[PDB]
Amino acid sequence: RLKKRMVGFIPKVIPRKIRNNMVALRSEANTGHMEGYIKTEAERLDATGRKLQKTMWDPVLQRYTLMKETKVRGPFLTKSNIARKVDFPVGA
Amino acid sequence: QAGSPRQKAKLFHVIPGTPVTPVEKLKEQRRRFGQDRYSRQPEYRPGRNVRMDPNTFTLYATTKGVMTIRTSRINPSYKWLDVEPDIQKVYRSRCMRAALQARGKASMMVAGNVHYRAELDHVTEPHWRERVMRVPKATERFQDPNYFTRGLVPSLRPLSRYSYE
RNA sequence: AAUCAAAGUUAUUAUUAAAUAAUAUUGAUUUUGGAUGAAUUUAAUUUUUAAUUAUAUUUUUGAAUUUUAAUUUUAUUAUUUUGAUUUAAUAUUUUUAAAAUAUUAUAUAUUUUAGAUUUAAAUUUGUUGUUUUAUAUUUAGUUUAAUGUUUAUAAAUUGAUAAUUAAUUUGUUUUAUUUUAAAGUUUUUAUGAACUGUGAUUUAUAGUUUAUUAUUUUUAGUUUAAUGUUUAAAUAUUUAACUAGUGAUGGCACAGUUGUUCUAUAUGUACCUAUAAAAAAUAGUAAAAUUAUUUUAAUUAAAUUAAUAAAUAAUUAUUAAACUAAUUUUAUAUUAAUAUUAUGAAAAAUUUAAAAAUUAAUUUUUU
RNA sequence: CGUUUAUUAAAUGCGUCGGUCUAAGUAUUAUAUUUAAGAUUAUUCUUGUAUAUAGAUUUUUAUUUUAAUUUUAUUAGUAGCAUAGUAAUUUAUUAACUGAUUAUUAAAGCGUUCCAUAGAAAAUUUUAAAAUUAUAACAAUCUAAAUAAAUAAUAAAUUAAAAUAAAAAUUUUAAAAAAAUUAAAAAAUUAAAAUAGGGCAAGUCCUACUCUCCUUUACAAAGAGAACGUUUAUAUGUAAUUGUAUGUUUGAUUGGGGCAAUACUAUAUCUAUUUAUAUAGAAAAAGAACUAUAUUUAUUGAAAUAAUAAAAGGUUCGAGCAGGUUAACAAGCAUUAAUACUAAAUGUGUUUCAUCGUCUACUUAUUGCUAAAUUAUAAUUGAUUGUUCAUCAAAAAAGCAAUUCGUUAGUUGGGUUAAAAUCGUUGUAAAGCAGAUUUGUUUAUAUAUUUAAUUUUUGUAUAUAGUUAAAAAUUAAUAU
């Protein structure tokens, strides 16, 4: 077709496309959930050297859990999201 | 220089004065984003039992009942949409009000008369201009917070300052 | 000056056409070779002269589709011996060839003159009979099934497993059709080098200027002009020009996505777009048409969108519907289901625009 | 010095030169080209193809190809030279849009340039038979009738004329209002034409190159103890013949809103996370990314190819637009076989001061209209040209400069069929007739606009009028 890049209303800026403006807040509870979130201007600019974090309803667990930011493209439950075993302070 | 799109029709989807269900858009207002900026003031602000949709400024009723427009007494440019829930309460009067005025026995000074409302308010509240024109001193607008702890004033509302009548 | 409306019958002669029918078939229209053969050779694992009972699957997501039907069992390639049967069609030639009304200074056939006039079809995108077709006579001239009677029974659902208190018809299984005429094209192979290219092909039948065998040039077939313009000619008459070819009108030789080219996209048999042959290409997206009088319910619309109109609303249409307060004891076309190749509204009232009309507008819009 | 389908600075051809070739032909040779011979010379500089190259690409310029935008030196230069122009000067002509000369910054000629140059095409001078203007001037051959009997075209006509208004159009109708047969000539109208000329739509064609894509025969890799043919892989070449190269308003725009009478052509203005649906991939729970004229179907961009076939519809107009002393005017869009401007011939209705009024011929260029020469110099509108030419404008025949990556595009010059038996109207004549012009209709027919000499030159004033006459422009005009 050609015309791969459109020219009517090329928008000045565009929030969704900016080095890390749209971020998948995947859950720290490694349930594989994610909630795509565009960092507002409060974090659009590098106000945060730290990787964004939020508390969001984890619909799988039905519990409010952490949401660590992460690139929106990628498998969300890799062999890196395995937590090292631990014996809880319960049990005999 | 350029082109332009056609202005959509933002008009009533019911007949004012007649009964109304909730799944009816009472009026599909111009969210007057002057040109897709983020500040507008709708023509018909929401009224009794009417709740405005935030996005498209369309008023949907919340309970089934007869609908009406209340033009503000101060400025006849700013209107509310009242839905009064009882449909029999108005039908069983209209069927009288229109049966009385047929026999010539109804009075035309009714509140609901369109051309009388200008005078109606003034028969009852003769200085209502001064009750809305009065400018409040910043002292009384923030009544002594201690009167709230001592309980004299039931609850301080500091932002509700404007008389919308 | 001048009109005047009107002749329907030849006369005479007899065994084809078309489909069909499931028996034959080494190439139809003289006598090969006629030295003795070498000269009369068409054969190969592919929808082929071999022609196949489903709607589910599966699939570049969108033209791709169903498997033995009874194993040699009959769906199988067909005529003389009823003018061979049947049904449809019907002529073709010979020689026929006809007829007695309306003025008297002038619009158009009616007798009694005056009244009377779009010729039609299309096209009118109401730039509203918009410059298109028709000489006439006759023949030939265009395919969507207007119907449901007894054996007899259907009807949904998840993404998927499954679930189906979920509520209900009809049908001895209904399929097939889809306009008509018309391109340039386009691909598939057969014919052509007698025209004309180029290859090759002729080794001295007239005149002449110059010392010269080179060279001026007699020059009646040819760079011009007149005539001709369906012409005597799909190129001729008269005429200007030019003319010196031991290097060329010419033995046979090259052929079509290609030959040849002293090259002009020129010619290769009288338009090179080669001919010839075989298709149903597309043509609704302003082409031309689309055959049957006397009838028996009306109207327009104008919005979402378009690498700009086959699609949607709205209208119109076919078929069908039920009577929610409002009034008279008035008056009311509202709908459903399907069918639908459409973007622009006289005179006003105004509104954009140099408009110099277009544009918005919205009531017209004749059987 | 030959040779050609629109016939020539077309293409040939000898020489020189560049490149190639020593296992098929002779390397002072034959292939493969670019130029053009003869005579002078043949300049400056490089970004890419080619060569050479080293796994390849990427790099990389002895010679060659193509290039030089301020290459521009030689050289000619208003020239087939993008406009500017009729270049400014000089001649030449009575008049110089001619042509030639000088020089010379030529929109961007240029070394294959320039000179030399013959019969060609121009420009002079000059002479001259074609019947060249003036100018008109039949000797010749080309009957009727009698006979044979074709063609284009054909809706009809009893109206066709004529005048006027129109309304969409050129007018043709409609309407009003007006009033003449058969025969032959003429071409004003009907369609006197053919067929060219446009531009638009959908369709197909054909050619071209850095960007699209196969069947592709080349290059490279690999495999065969590599005896050579094949198969692959990676590559994709305009050598490749596929398809795209738009749509809308005229050249920019394509989005979703809003203000402008809750009209909106794009009208006029602006805004902005107002968001780009599906399908394969990407994310596997409820959550998610990418991109397309942002309704979103296709796989590049360009050409005139003499482009075409089936259609309608305009350049030259009952109305528009931009560049002439500022402003009145040439004239790129709403009709429609009207089928180019000019000339020739031949008309016409207007309108324009005091009689009263409208005949100039030439030069250059055939563009058109002026400039300007003849003492003195053509009123302005309008309808006009199928009868006549073609000069212009003009359809791969070229070429120059110019734009193009190319195919090609636009200025300039040389080329380049322009045409049918006249049926209706129309009009000129005629109908053989006449012892006779004429009552009224109606009129192709009308004395002057290339100036003299008289005579009054006096009246008036610094020069001098006015009726007329002669001569000149030389010809006569009646249907019953």
Name every residue whose Cβ is closer than 8 Å to that of residue A68 and which is 6 or more positions away in sequence: A25, A26, A27, A28, A51, A52, A53
Unique residue bearing structure tokens 């109804």: B106
Strands A34-38 and A22-27: antiparallel
The residues that bridge with A53 in the sheet, in sequence order, are A68
| A37 vs A48: CA distance, rounded Å | 15
Give chain D positions with protein CB within 7 A: 252-260, 262-274, 276, 282-294, 298-301
Q: Which residues contact B68 (CB under 8 A, 6 or more apart)?
A: B16, B17, B81, B82, B83, B84
Per-residue DSSP letter, A5: S
Nearest to B116 by CA among B106, B103, B105, B130: B106
Beta bridge partners of A22: A38
Q: Tell me the resolution in Å.
A: 3.6
- CA nearest to B93, candidates B74, B112, B79, B109: B112
Instruction: Find where tokens 């308010």 sit.
Output: B121
SS3 A23: strand
Contact B26, B14 (CB under 8 A): yes
- The bases of strand C with some atom under 7 A from any protein CB are 303-305, 307, 325-326
Identity of residue A2: L
Cα R_g (chain B), whole angstroms? 21
Q: Detail the DSSP E strand segments found in chain B.
A: 19-20, 25-28, 44-46, 50-52, 58-61, 65-71, 79-84
Q: How far apart are the first and last CA of chain A?
A: 70
A60 near A28, Cβ under 8 Å? Answer: no
The reply to whether A3 Cβ lies less than 7 angstroms from strand C is: yes
| Single-letter amino acid code for the residue at B46 | P
Pairwise CA distance, residues B132 & B163, whole Å:
6
Give the CA-to-C1' distance from A26 to D304 in angstroms: 64
DSSP-assigned beta bridge partners for residue A63:
A58
The pair of three-digit structure tokens given for residue B11, joined into one six-digit string = 């008009």
Give distance CA A39 / C1' D369 (Å): 78
Question: What is the Cα–Cα distance from B126 to B113, expressed in whole angstroms?
Answer: 19
Q: What are phi and psi of A22, to 5 degrees?
A: -100, 125
Dist CA A8 CA B59 (whole Å): 34
| Beta strands B44-46; B79-84: pairing state | parallel
**Torsion angle defined by CA atoms of residues A69, A74, A76 and A81, in that order, rounded to the nearest 10 degrees:** -80
**Whole-angstrom distance, CA of residue A69 vs CA of residue A46:** 14
Distance B39 CA to D260 C1' (A): 20
Give the technique used to solve this structure: cryo-EM
